[PDB]
Amino acid sequence: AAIRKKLVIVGDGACGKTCLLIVFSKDPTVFENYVADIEVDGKQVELALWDTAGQEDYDRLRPLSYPDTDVILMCFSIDSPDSLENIPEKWTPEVKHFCPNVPIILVGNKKDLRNDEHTRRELAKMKQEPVKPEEGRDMANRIGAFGYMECSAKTKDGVREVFEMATRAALQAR
Amino acid sequence: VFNRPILFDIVSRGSTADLDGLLPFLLTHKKRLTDEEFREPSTGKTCLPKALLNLSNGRNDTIPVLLDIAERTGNMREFINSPFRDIYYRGQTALHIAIERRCKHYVELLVAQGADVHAQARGRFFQPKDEGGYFYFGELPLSLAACTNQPHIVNYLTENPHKKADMRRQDSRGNTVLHALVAIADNTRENTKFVTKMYDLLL
Ligand SMILES: Nc1nc2c(ncn2[C@@H]2O[C@H](COP(=O)(O)OP(=O)(O)O)[C@@H](O)[C@H]2O)c(=O)[nH]1
């Protein structure tokens, strides 16, 4: 009865791609199609979770996942400052050439690391002064998207809604 | 001791008598049977496929032990599910192999570990004979057992206590199992016998 889509979540390495996928899956580096079941709006849809490598220059295997992808999840990290800006640099032009036109819901997990007094002193020494939502909201406006839910992994309340805005975009045209 | 070639040899050879040492080697070194250094690089072909293509009279005894190591290491829904990642055998799991080899001894065993009864062989090979392909069975395991005259497997995948596939699942093109059978149709009297005998079973 169900329908099923493919999910090829992208990031910049160690942005917390995989630790998210754990939390949605069960409720630790690889995810093949660990077919997860989610009730979006009354359809009881399965969602295939193709976690990808990262920045390990695995372009050997990286492009073998994108064919027939329709729900992309370009990650960044909140404790990652404008290092965040690999999106228009590496990852967006790459999903621009290996999947023609699909949704792009921009993750942004580790939302419970702003107010991190521990890494505040680290990232303060960096001078970099971690990101603003409006900063990546413009990155969202820059790309064209179907959501900018930030996310959170260790602390929950932030994994669930990310797949709502994601799934619903895959159910659209194309 | 265990590189790729030395073991793919073993599993093709059919010997569950000499690889005693996977577990104390593959656990002390902390690796797994699905890592990239233990797969063929082009396809994605892991052991569990290689056993099933290289089958001895309907019986390769090197699926059961392998899965036991994959458990005792810990991966069943990642070792059984590992599909081929090439543009000419895409999707094809162990299950997609265990059905075209007409091997039902192991589909009872795969599905019992929750493999995937709805995977989709999208590859250019598993694509119709008007596109640059050879054989189109739908894309599902159920549709293959149906489009290869196997009433004993169709009657398994839809009545299991483990995993009950459904006839109404929908491939990457829309064509149900029922409109695969009218897409593999060479109008003999052998083709149109089991088609109508199998198209009247599901409906
Ligand atoms: N403190 C904290 N750490 C997180 C959170 N989400 C992920 N991590 C950390 O991210 C690390 C691994 O992330 P991973 O998803 O593997 O990064 P990837 O390389 O992008 O997959 C783990 O050590 C986690 O502690 C979070 O919400 N809070």
Short mmCIF file of C-alpha atoms and ligand atoms in Angstrom, two decimals:
data_model
loop_
_atom_site.label_atom_id
_atom_site.label_comp_id
_atom_site.label_asym_id
_atom_site.label_seq_id
_atom_site.Cartn_x
_atom_site.Cartn_y
_atom_site.Cartn_z
CA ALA A 1 0.00 0.00 0.00
CA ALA A 2 2.84 2.33 0.91
CA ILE A 3 5.13 4.38 -1.32
CA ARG A 4 8.85 4.80 -0.70
CA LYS A 5 11.46 7.46 -1.47
CA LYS A 6 15.25 7.65 -1.15
CA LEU A 7 17.22 9.93 1.16
CA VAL A 8 20.81 10.82 0.37
CA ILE A 9 21.65 13.18 3.27
CA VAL A 10 24.74 15.32 2.63
CA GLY A 11 27.03 17.42 4.83
CA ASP A 12 30.68 18.42 5.17
CA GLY A 13 31.92 15.61 7.41
CA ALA A 14 31.47 15.44 11.17
CA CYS A 15 28.51 17.83 10.99
CA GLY A 16 26.49 15.10 12.71
CA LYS A 17 24.89 13.45 9.68
CA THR A 18 25.01 9.94 11.02
CA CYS A 19 24.19 10.47 14.71
CA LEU A 20 20.94 12.00 13.50
CA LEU A 21 20.17 8.97 11.33
CA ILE A 22 20.67 6.74 14.39
CA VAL A 23 18.05 8.60 16.40
CA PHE A 24 15.37 8.59 13.72
CA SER A 25 16.15 4.99 12.77
CA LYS A 26 16.11 3.27 16.16
CA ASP A 27 13.58 5.58 17.86
CA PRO A 28 27.55 4.00 13.61
CA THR A 29 29.03 5.45 10.40
CA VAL A 30 27.16 3.63 7.60
CA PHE A 31 23.48 3.51 6.67
CA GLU A 32 22.38 1.49 3.66
CA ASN A 33 18.61 1.44 2.95
CA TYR A 34 17.61 0.98 6.56
CA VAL A 35 14.00 1.36 5.47
CA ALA A 36 12.25 3.46 8.12
CA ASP A 37 8.49 3.91 8.37
CA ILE A 38 6.96 7.34 8.93
CA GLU A 39 3.36 8.58 8.84
CA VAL A 40 3.56 11.96 7.13
CA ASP A 41 -0.08 13.00 6.52
CA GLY A 42 -2.02 9.72 6.34
CA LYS A 43 0.00 7.69 3.82
CA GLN A 44 2.23 5.46 6.00
CA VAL A 45 5.36 6.07 3.93
CA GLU A 46 8.69 4.27 4.02
CA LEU A 47 11.84 6.40 3.71
CA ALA A 48 15.15 4.93 2.50
CA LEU A 49 18.11 6.49 4.29
CA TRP A 50 21.27 6.63 2.13
CA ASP A 51 23.85 8.16 4.46
CA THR A 52 26.92 9.28 2.49
CA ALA A 53 30.60 9.45 3.40
CA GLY A 54 31.49 13.12 3.86
CA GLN A 55 34.87 14.74 3.14
CA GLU A 56 36.81 11.45 2.86
CA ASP A 57 37.25 12.09 -0.93
CA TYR A 58 35.06 9.02 -1.59
CA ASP A 59 33.93 10.50 -4.94
CA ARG A 60 34.59 6.93 -6.07
CA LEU A 61 31.39 5.87 -4.28
CA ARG A 62 29.65 9.21 -3.51
CA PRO A 63 27.93 9.59 -6.94
CA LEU A 64 26.67 5.99 -6.99
CA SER A 65 24.00 6.94 -4.41
CA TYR A 66 22.41 10.02 -5.99
CA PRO A 67 20.54 8.32 -8.92
CA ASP A 68 16.81 8.38 -8.23
CA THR A 69 17.21 10.63 -5.17
CA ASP A 70 14.38 12.99 -4.28
CA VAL A 71 14.62 14.32 -0.68
CA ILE A 72 18.19 15.74 -0.17
CA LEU A 73 19.26 16.97 3.32
CA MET A 74 22.30 19.29 3.03
CA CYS A 75 23.66 19.33 6.59
CA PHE A 76 25.71 21.93 8.35
CA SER A 77 26.71 22.38 12.00
CA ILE A 78 25.73 25.22 14.33
CA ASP A 79 29.16 25.07 16.00
CA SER A 80 30.59 25.19 12.47
CA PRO A 81 31.01 28.84 11.40
CA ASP A 82 31.33 29.96 7.73
CA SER A 83 33.13 26.69 7.14
CA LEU A 84 29.36 26.11 6.73
CA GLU A 85 29.89 27.72 3.31
CA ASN A 86 30.84 24.52 1.56
CA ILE A 87 27.18 24.37 0.45
CA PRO A 88 27.41 26.64 -2.66
CA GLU A 89 31.07 25.63 -3.02
CA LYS A 90 31.20 21.82 -3.11
CA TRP A 91 27.91 20.17 -2.24
CA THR A 92 25.23 22.19 -4.01
CA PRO A 93 27.00 22.25 -7.42
CA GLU A 94 27.56 18.51 -7.00
CA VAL A 95 23.88 17.68 -6.39
CA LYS A 96 23.21 20.17 -9.21
CA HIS A 97 24.99 17.81 -11.64
CA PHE A 98 24.15 14.35 -10.22
CA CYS A 99 20.46 14.94 -9.53
CA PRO A 100 18.71 17.44 -11.89
CA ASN A 101 15.98 19.07 -9.78
CA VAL A 102 14.88 17.71 -6.41
CA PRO A 103 14.04 19.14 -2.97
CA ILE A 104 16.81 20.40 -0.69
CA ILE A 105 15.86 20.66 3.00
CA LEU A 106 18.82 22.23 4.77
CA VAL A 107 19.72 20.59 8.11
CA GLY A 108 21.86 22.40 10.60
CA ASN A 109 21.92 20.10 13.65
CA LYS A 110 23.83 20.52 16.92
CA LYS A 111 21.39 23.27 17.90
CA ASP A 112 22.15 22.29 21.51
CA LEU A 113 25.76 23.44 21.07
CA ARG A 114 24.83 27.10 20.93
CA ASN A 115 24.82 27.95 24.66
CA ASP A 116 27.81 25.58 24.90
CA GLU A 117 30.06 27.41 27.38
CA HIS A 118 32.69 24.72 26.80
CA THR A 119 33.08 25.21 23.04
CA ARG A 120 32.11 28.88 23.34
CA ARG A 121 35.59 29.59 24.70
CA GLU A 122 37.00 27.45 21.89
CA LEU A 123 34.95 29.11 19.13
CA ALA A 124 35.55 32.50 20.78
CA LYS A 125 39.30 31.96 20.42
CA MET A 126 38.55 31.09 16.78
CA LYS A 127 37.14 34.66 16.38
CA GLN A 128 34.50 33.01 14.19
CA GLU A 129 31.48 33.60 16.44
CA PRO A 130 29.11 30.72 15.44
CA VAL A 131 26.24 31.09 13.06
CA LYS A 132 22.87 32.91 13.09
CA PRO A 133 19.62 31.35 11.79
CA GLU A 134 19.21 34.32 9.48
CA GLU A 135 22.73 33.57 8.21
CA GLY A 136 21.71 30.13 6.93
CA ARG A 137 18.15 31.23 6.20
CA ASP A 138 19.79 33.34 3.49
CA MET A 139 21.76 30.26 2.47
CA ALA A 140 18.34 28.60 2.26
CA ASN A 141 16.99 31.51 0.22
CA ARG A 142 20.17 31.33 -1.86
CA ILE A 143 19.61 27.71 -2.94
CA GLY A 144 15.86 27.27 -3.16
CA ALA A 145 14.45 24.78 -0.72
CA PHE A 146 11.44 23.29 1.10
CA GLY A 147 12.55 24.01 4.66
CA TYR A 148 15.24 25.23 7.05
CA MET A 149 14.55 23.18 10.18
CA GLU A 150 17.75 23.45 12.14
CA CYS A 151 18.02 20.13 13.93
CA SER A 152 19.17 18.40 17.12
CA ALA A 153 20.50 14.89 17.82
CA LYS A 154 21.50 14.21 21.44
CA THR A 155 18.72 16.42 22.72
CA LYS A 156 15.56 15.33 20.85
CA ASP A 157 12.69 17.61 19.73
CA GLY A 158 14.29 18.46 16.39
CA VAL A 159 14.78 15.11 14.65
CA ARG A 160 11.10 14.44 13.99
CA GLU A 161 9.97 17.60 12.19
CA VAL A 162 13.00 17.54 9.87
CA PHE A 163 11.66 14.48 8.06
CA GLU A 164 8.18 16.01 7.82
CA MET A 165 9.31 18.96 5.70
CA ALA A 166 11.66 16.58 3.88
CA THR A 167 9.24 13.76 2.97
CA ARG A 168 6.46 16.12 1.89
CA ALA A 169 8.77 17.67 -0.71
CA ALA A 170 9.54 14.27 -2.25
CA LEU A 171 5.80 13.58 -2.63
CA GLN A 172 5.57 16.68 -4.86
CA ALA A 173 5.89 16.67 -8.66
CA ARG A 174 8.82 14.86 -10.27
CA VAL B 1 44.56 -13.99 6.52
CA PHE B 2 41.24 -12.86 5.02
CA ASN B 3 41.51 -10.45 2.11
CA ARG B 4 38.77 -10.12 -0.49
CA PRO B 5 39.92 -12.73 -3.05
CA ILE B 6 40.88 -15.48 -0.62
CA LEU B 7 37.37 -15.65 0.83
CA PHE B 8 35.27 -14.97 -2.27
CA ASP B 9 37.15 -18.02 -3.48
CA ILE B 10 35.96 -19.93 -0.41
CA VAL B 11 32.31 -18.94 -0.70
CA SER B 12 32.18 -19.72 -4.42
CA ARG B 13 33.89 -23.00 -3.63
CA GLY B 14 31.18 -23.97 -1.15
CA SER B 15 33.33 -24.80 1.90
CA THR B 16 31.87 -24.13 5.32
CA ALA B 17 34.73 -26.25 6.66
CA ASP B 18 37.84 -24.05 6.35
CA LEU B 19 36.80 -20.47 7.17
CA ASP B 20 36.73 -21.20 10.90
CA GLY B 21 38.53 -18.06 11.95
CA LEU B 22 36.41 -15.26 10.51
CA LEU B 23 34.92 -14.53 13.94
CA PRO B 24 38.17 -14.49 16.00
CA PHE B 25 39.82 -12.49 13.19
CA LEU B 26 36.93 -10.24 12.19
CA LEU B 27 36.20 -9.35 15.84
CA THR B 28 39.73 -8.82 17.18
CA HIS B 29 40.53 -6.54 14.23
CA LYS B 30 37.07 -4.96 14.56
CA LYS B 31 36.04 -5.03 10.90
CA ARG B 32 32.79 -6.17 9.23
CA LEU B 33 31.69 -8.30 6.27
CA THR B 34 30.26 -5.26 4.45
CA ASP B 35 33.22 -2.86 4.62
CA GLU B 36 34.61 -1.62 1.30
CA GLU B 37 37.80 -3.73 1.64
CA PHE B 38 35.62 -6.86 1.62
CA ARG B 39 33.42 -6.24 -1.45
CA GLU B 40 34.03 -6.31 -5.17
CA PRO B 41 34.68 -2.69 -6.16
CA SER B 42 32.64 -2.35 -9.34
CA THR B 43 29.33 -4.01 -8.47
CA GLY B 44 29.09 -3.96 -4.72
CA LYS B 45 28.91 -7.74 -4.68
CA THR B 46 29.34 -9.06 -1.16
CA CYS B 47 29.78 -12.69 -0.06
CA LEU B 48 26.07 -13.58 0.38
CA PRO B 49 25.49 -12.91 -3.33
CA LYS B 50 28.63 -14.77 -4.38
CA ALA B 51 27.46 -17.87 -2.53
CA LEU B 52 24.11 -17.76 -4.31
CA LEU B 53 25.42 -17.29 -7.85
CA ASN B 54 27.96 -20.08 -7.25
CA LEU B 55 25.45 -22.65 -6.06
CA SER B 56 26.04 -26.40 -5.69
CA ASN B 57 22.90 -28.42 -6.63
CA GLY B 58 20.59 -26.03 -4.81
CA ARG B 59 22.75 -25.88 -1.69
CA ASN B 60 25.55 -23.53 -0.68
CA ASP B 61 26.35 -24.15 2.99
CA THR B 62 28.14 -20.78 3.34
CA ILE B 63 25.13 -18.51 3.78
CA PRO B 64 24.23 -19.81 7.30
CA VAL B 65 27.67 -19.45 8.87
CA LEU B 66 28.29 -16.06 7.22
CA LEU B 67 25.11 -14.59 8.70
CA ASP B 68 26.05 -16.02 12.10
CA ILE B 69 29.33 -14.11 11.95
CA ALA B 70 27.43 -11.07 10.67
CA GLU B 71 25.25 -11.34 13.79
CA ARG B 72 28.09 -12.06 16.22
CA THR B 73 29.84 -9.06 14.73
CA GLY B 74 26.41 -7.45 14.37
CA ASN B 75 24.92 -6.62 11.01
CA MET B 76 21.95 -8.41 9.40
CA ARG B 77 19.84 -5.58 8.02
CA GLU B 78 23.06 -4.14 6.54
CA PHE B 79 24.82 -7.32 5.36
CA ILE B 80 21.73 -8.96 3.86
CA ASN B 81 20.45 -5.68 2.42
CA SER B 82 23.72 -4.48 0.83
CA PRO B 83 22.59 -3.92 -2.77
CA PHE B 84 24.74 -3.69 -5.88
CA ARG B 85 25.86 -0.10 -6.49
CA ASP B 86 26.50 -0.23 -10.24
CA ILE B 87 24.53 1.01 -13.25
CA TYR B 88 24.08 -2.50 -14.72
CA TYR B 89 23.06 -4.63 -11.69
CA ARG B 90 21.54 -1.94 -9.44
CA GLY B 91 19.35 -2.85 -6.48
CA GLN B 92 19.93 -6.61 -6.75
CA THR B 93 20.19 -8.05 -3.24
CA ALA B 94 20.70 -11.60 -2.10
CA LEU B 95 16.92 -12.00 -2.29
CA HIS B 96 16.80 -10.89 -5.93
CA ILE B 97 19.36 -13.64 -6.55
CA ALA B 98 17.72 -16.28 -4.37
CA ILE B 99 14.52 -16.05 -6.45
CA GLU B 100 16.00 -16.26 -9.96
CA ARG B 101 18.21 -19.14 -8.85
CA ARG B 102 14.84 -20.68 -7.82
CA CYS B 103 16.30 -21.29 -4.38
CA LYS B 104 13.58 -21.33 -1.72
CA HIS B 105 15.77 -22.98 0.93
CA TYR B 106 17.25 -19.56 1.67
CA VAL B 107 14.42 -17.08 1.03
CA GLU B 108 12.85 -18.56 4.16
CA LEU B 109 16.19 -17.77 5.82
CA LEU B 110 16.81 -14.29 4.39
CA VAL B 111 13.32 -12.94 5.15
CA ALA B 112 13.55 -14.49 8.63
CA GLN B 113 16.24 -11.86 9.32
CA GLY B 114 14.13 -9.10 7.77
CA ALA B 115 15.99 -8.55 4.54
CA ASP B 116 13.87 -6.49 2.11
CA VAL B 117 10.79 -7.70 0.24
CA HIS B 118 10.35 -4.38 -1.60
CA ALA B 119 13.83 -3.53 -2.93
CA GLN B 120 13.92 -2.20 -6.49
CA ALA B 121 16.31 -3.46 -9.17
CA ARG B 122 16.47 -0.25 -11.19
CA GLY B 123 19.55 -1.31 -13.12
CA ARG B 124 19.90 -1.02 -16.88
CA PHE B 125 20.03 -4.82 -17.09
CA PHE B 126 16.83 -5.27 -15.10
CA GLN B 127 15.13 -2.91 -17.55
CA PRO B 128 12.81 -3.72 -20.51
CA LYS B 129 13.81 -4.87 -23.99
CA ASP B 130 13.04 -1.48 -25.55
CA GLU B 131 15.51 0.56 -23.48
CA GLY B 132 18.90 -1.18 -23.69
CA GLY B 133 18.10 -4.02 -21.35
CA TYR B 134 17.26 -7.69 -21.16
CA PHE B 135 14.63 -8.60 -18.56
CA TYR B 136 11.98 -6.49 -16.82
CA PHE B 137 10.18 -8.20 -13.94
CA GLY B 138 8.77 -5.09 -12.39
CA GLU B 139 11.46 -4.21 -9.89
CA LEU B 140 10.41 -6.09 -6.75
CA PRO B 141 11.25 -9.53 -5.37
CA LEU B 142 7.58 -10.51 -5.37
CA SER B 143 7.21 -9.50 -9.00
CA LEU B 144 10.23 -11.63 -9.93
CA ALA B 145 8.91 -14.76 -8.25
CA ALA B 146 5.65 -13.98 -10.01
CA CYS B 147 7.30 -13.29 -13.37
CA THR B 148 9.41 -16.47 -13.10
CA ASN B 149 6.64 -18.98 -12.33
CA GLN B 150 7.18 -19.62 -8.60
CA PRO B 151 3.81 -20.03 -6.86
CA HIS B 152 5.64 -21.43 -3.84
CA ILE B 153 7.53 -18.18 -3.20
CA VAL B 154 4.71 -15.78 -4.07
CA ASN B 155 2.70 -17.76 -1.52
CA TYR B 156 5.53 -17.24 0.98
CA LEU B 157 6.28 -13.51 0.66
CA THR B 158 2.58 -12.66 1.18
CA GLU B 159 1.87 -15.00 4.13
CA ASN B 160 5.01 -14.87 6.31
CA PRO B 161 4.98 -14.39 10.08
CA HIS B 162 8.17 -12.37 9.60
CA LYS B 163 7.59 -9.99 6.69
CA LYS B 164 4.42 -9.86 4.58
CA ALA B 165 5.03 -8.19 1.24
CA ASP B 166 1.95 -6.76 -0.47
CA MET B 167 0.87 -7.10 -4.09
CA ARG B 168 0.04 -3.39 -4.25
CA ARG B 169 3.55 -2.00 -3.74
CA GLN B 170 4.55 0.36 -6.50
CA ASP B 171 7.83 0.30 -8.43
CA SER B 172 9.88 3.25 -9.75
CA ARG B 173 7.61 3.29 -12.84
CA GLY B 174 4.17 2.48 -11.38
CA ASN B 175 3.77 -0.98 -12.87
CA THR B 176 2.41 -3.36 -10.25
CA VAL B 177 3.30 -7.05 -10.33
CA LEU B 178 0.08 -7.54 -12.28
CA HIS B 179 1.14 -5.16 -15.05
CA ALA B 180 4.57 -6.73 -15.16
CA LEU B 181 3.05 -10.06 -16.26
CA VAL B 182 1.41 -8.27 -19.21
CA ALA B 183 4.82 -6.68 -19.92
CA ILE B 184 6.67 -10.00 -20.02
CA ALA B 185 4.40 -11.64 -22.56
CA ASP B 186 5.74 -13.61 -25.50
CA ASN B 187 2.60 -15.14 -26.88
CA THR B 188 3.45 -18.83 -26.68
CA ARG B 189 1.15 -21.28 -24.92
CA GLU B 190 3.71 -21.80 -22.13
CA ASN B 191 4.11 -18.09 -21.41
CA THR B 192 0.38 -17.41 -21.45
CA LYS B 193 -0.33 -20.47 -19.32
CA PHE B 194 1.46 -19.55 -16.11
CA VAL B 195 0.84 -15.83 -16.65
CA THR B 196 -2.92 -16.36 -16.54
CA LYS B 197 -2.43 -18.94 -13.80
CA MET B 198 -0.36 -16.43 -11.80
CA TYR B 199 -2.31 -13.31 -12.78
CA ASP B 200 -5.44 -15.05 -11.51
CA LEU B 201 -3.73 -16.00 -8.23
CA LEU B 202 -2.93 -12.49 -7.05
CA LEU B 203 -6.04 -10.62 -8.23
N1 LIG C 1 26.88 17.25 21.89
C1 LIG C 1 26.29 16.80 20.76
N2 LIG C 1 27.01 16.04 19.91
C2 LIG C 1 26.47 15.57 18.77
C3 LIG C 1 25.08 15.90 18.45
N3 LIG C 1 24.82 15.31 17.28
C4 LIG C 1 25.94 14.65 16.87
N4 LIG C 1 26.91 14.82 17.77
C5 LIG C 1 28.29 14.29 17.71
O1 LIG C 1 28.70 13.97 16.38
C6 LIG C 1 29.68 12.93 16.46
C7 LIG C 1 29.60 12.04 15.22
O2 LIG C 1 28.76 12.66 14.26
P1 LIG C 1 28.53 12.00 12.81
O3 LIG C 1 27.07 12.10 12.54
O4 LIG C 1 29.23 10.67 12.75
O5 LIG C 1 29.29 13.01 11.82
P2 LIG C 1 29.37 12.69 10.24
O6 LIG C 1 30.81 12.37 9.96
O7 LIG C 1 28.89 13.98 9.62
O8 LIG C 1 28.47 11.50 10.08
C8 LIG C 1 29.42 12.20 17.77
O9 LIG C 1 30.61 12.10 18.54
C9 LIG C 1 28.38 13.01 18.51
O10 LIG C 1 28.76 13.27 19.86
C10 LIG C 1 24.36 16.74 19.44
O11 LIG C 1 23.17 17.07 19.26
N5 LIG C 1 25.01 17.14 20.53
#
